[PDB]
Structure 1
């Protein structure tokens, strides 16, 4: 069975393994070369202002030249996406489902996704009848018990609001 990419339901490979053009995980030219879908593609996938605003898979950094990678060349000066070394303000959604903290910065972990989380992958953002009709952000679904999220547990049976199925 396929492992990754279009053929694999959009899954990513573990440990920066390249997803080949055929939807399998590995390293070397056959996986990381022409048609590489994600992982440590070589060259790096195109991104940002060089890819219609598409972000890098696997949280790679998008360089000023619009290539995906890691290192100062990618995450440092001129970085236009991913875990750039520069702080990312929000208040305006964060990219890639990153949490907008109470202080208006993008990140993951409890300081961003916990108490005061404004948007993105918040830990426990309340919604629906339990929250007096509060709406979820990011077009997330409001689950039956009144938490914002995505996936079957939130968009499935009992989904109160958002893009229920």
Structure 2
């Protein structure tokens, strides 16, 4: 019956819906208040230096104060994670599986994850016996066909390297 959070296999709710302490999605104090696991919690979840490095769920910004949210107070000056307004440098893996572009910035989409992607959720990174025994980054699995990724297709049967099986 569960939808989200520790009860629901770590799933997130769509459209910033809060995951309650009990593992269901909604808005209002029952969901977003005490025990809120993810989504638009109020107050925001604790993040960054103020929670042992933990990033914000649902790609929220981590404020200078170490709360999760959106707006200039969270993403602007002093932002310490999520889609901060500042460019995010890498080369230092990108947080939360963001791609590190060939030019050393974090992002998602083909400019980051496509040609020249260094690490993170690259579109098409080759590995294993199809790529000279090359390893995957980010502790991803090498799939049977010698592509990097995660999930059963890469970590399951035929997995060559990384956290197989």
User: How far apart are the structure 2 equivalents of 1:29 and 1:153?
Assistant: 39
The CA deviation at 1:92 is 1.9
Provide structure 1 residue ranges, at least 5 long, that are not aligned to the other structure: none
Q: TM-score, normalised by structure 2?
A: 0.99
4+ long deviations beyond 3 Å: none
The CA deviation at 1:116 is 0.4
User: How far apart are the structure 1 equivalents of 2:65 and 2:157?
Assistant: 45
Q: Deviations over 1:89-146 (max 9, x none)?
A: 1112100000000000000000000000000000000000110100000000000001
Q: What aligned pairs does 1:1-150 form with structure 2 within 5 A after superposition?
A: 1-150=1-150
RMSD between aligned residues: 0.4
The CA deviation at 1:38 is 0.2
Provide structure 2 residue ranges, at least 5 long, that are not aligned to the other structure: none
Instruction: Give secondary structure in 2 for the equivalent of 1:15.
Output: coil
The CA deviation at 1:160 is 0.5
User: How far apart are the structure 2 equivalents of 1:103 and 1:57?
Assistant: 26
Instruction: Give secondary structure in 1 for the equivalent of 2:96.
Output: helix
User: How far apart are the structure 2 equivalents of 1:117 and 1:147?
Assistant: 14
The CA deviation at 1:16 is 0.3
User: How far apart are the structure 2 equivalents of 1:159 and 1:21?
Assistant: 36
User: How far apart are the structure 1 equivalents of 2:92 and 2:144?
Assistant: 27
The CA deviation at 1:32 is 0.3
User: How far apart are the structure 2 equivalents of 1:43 and 1:145?
Assistant: 45
User: How far apart are the structure 2 equivalents of 1:53 and 1:93?
Assistant: 14
User: How far apart are the structure 2 equivalents of 1:92 and 1:72?
Assistant: 25
Instruction: Give secondary structure in 2 for the equivalent of 1:102.
Output: coil
The CA deviation at 1:51 is 0.3
User: How far apart are the structure 2 equivalents of 1:26 and 1:140?
Assistant: 33
The CA deviation at 1:42 is 0.3
Instruction: Give secondary structure in 2 for the equivalent of 1:122.
Output: coil
User: How far apart are the structure 2 equivalents of 1:112 and 1:90?
Assistant: 11
